[PDB]
Ligand binder design. Structure first.
Ligand SMILES: [Mg+2]
Length: 293
């Protein structure tokens, strides 16, 4: 079959709420910015801007990048850290490591939201599940994960996606400051008072926070025994955790973490998938976790 026929099959699978349309097919991201039908709340918390979390309620449009959702340090001349596009071109050359999604697509009836980390902190979105429209499925991608942390979570009729980390090669940041920024964004988006946290905030803190304040969550993250704050040593029944990097799996391997939101049979399906890709000739899936919300 040709690219168009396969891509329409892909759309019909996605539109039935089938997460496996994204299973094994590698990472995807794009810098492209086209307005999609869905409005969501967006928030940014960054060490360079101490104080209130920045919040955006208006739709993402094509009429200029909001600097809170942009990183001048990405690429040769900057790149958005939060953008929306439609699925006729799923991955572009900005997607480090992309494979299948450079060739095939999800058609222009799919709406894609890319959420990256902030230069020194977290970006997040909150989606009202009852606003996902029939035959207009939505995909959230976090791009190529090489040390950052991605949270997907549900509370009531709302879904949250938060990506925290840094682009500045900072020692120890993501498992401490990155967690604090993610908690600030999650709290702002969910209208919760930012908790009085311990002086030491790390990935275990993130598990505890999500468990106590969200119905269900998935954390996809990097950890290593040489970096204790990165290691998760507690467990909570409503928080799944996926260490896409470990003591063995590191760069040039990479993680992926995606969600589909699909209105079908009068209900919004929400399904997430995290993978770890590593060299076998070929990048292979080393580990995977699929969680429904
Ligand atoms: Mg990072």
């Amino acid at each position: 079959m040709n690219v168009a026929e396969i891509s329409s099959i892909n759309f019909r699978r996605l539109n039935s709420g089938n997460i496996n349309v994204l299973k094994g097919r590698g990472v995807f991201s794009s810098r492209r910015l086209r307005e999609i039908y869905l409005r969501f709340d967006a928030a940014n918390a960054d060490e360079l801007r101490p104080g209130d979390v920045y919040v955006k309620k208006t739709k993402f449009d094509s009429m200029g990048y909001d600097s809170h959702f942009y990183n001048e340090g990405i690429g040769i001349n900057g790149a958005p850290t939060l953008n929306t596009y439609t699925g006729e071109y799923v991955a572009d050359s900005s997607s480090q490591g992309a494979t299948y999604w450079l060739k095939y697509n999800l058609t222009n009836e799919t709406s894609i939201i890319k959420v990256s980390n902030s230069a020194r902190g977290a970006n997040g979105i909150k989606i009202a599940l009852e606003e996902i429209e029939e035959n207009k499925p939505v995909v959230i991608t976090s791009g190529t994960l090489t040390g950052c942390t991605v949270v997907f979570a549900r509370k009531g009729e709302y879904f949250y996606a938060v990506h925290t980390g840094n682009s500045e090669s900072l020692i120890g940041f993501t498992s401490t400051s990155g967690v604090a920024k993610a908690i600030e964004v999650l709290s702002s988006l969910s209208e919760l008072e930012v908790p009085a946290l311990p002086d030491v905030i790390n990935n275990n803190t993130l598990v505890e926070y999500l468990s106590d304040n969200f119905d269900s969550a998935l954390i996809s993250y990097s950890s290593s025994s040489l970096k204790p704050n990165s290691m998760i040593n507690i467990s909570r029944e409503n928080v799944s955790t996926f260490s896409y990097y470990t003591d063995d799996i590191q760069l040039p391997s990479f993680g992926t973490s995606v969600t589909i939101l699909v209105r079908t049979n009068d209900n919004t399906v929400v399904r997430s998938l995290s993978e770890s890709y590593t060299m076998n000739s070929k990048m292979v899936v080393f580990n995977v976790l699929q969680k429904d919300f």
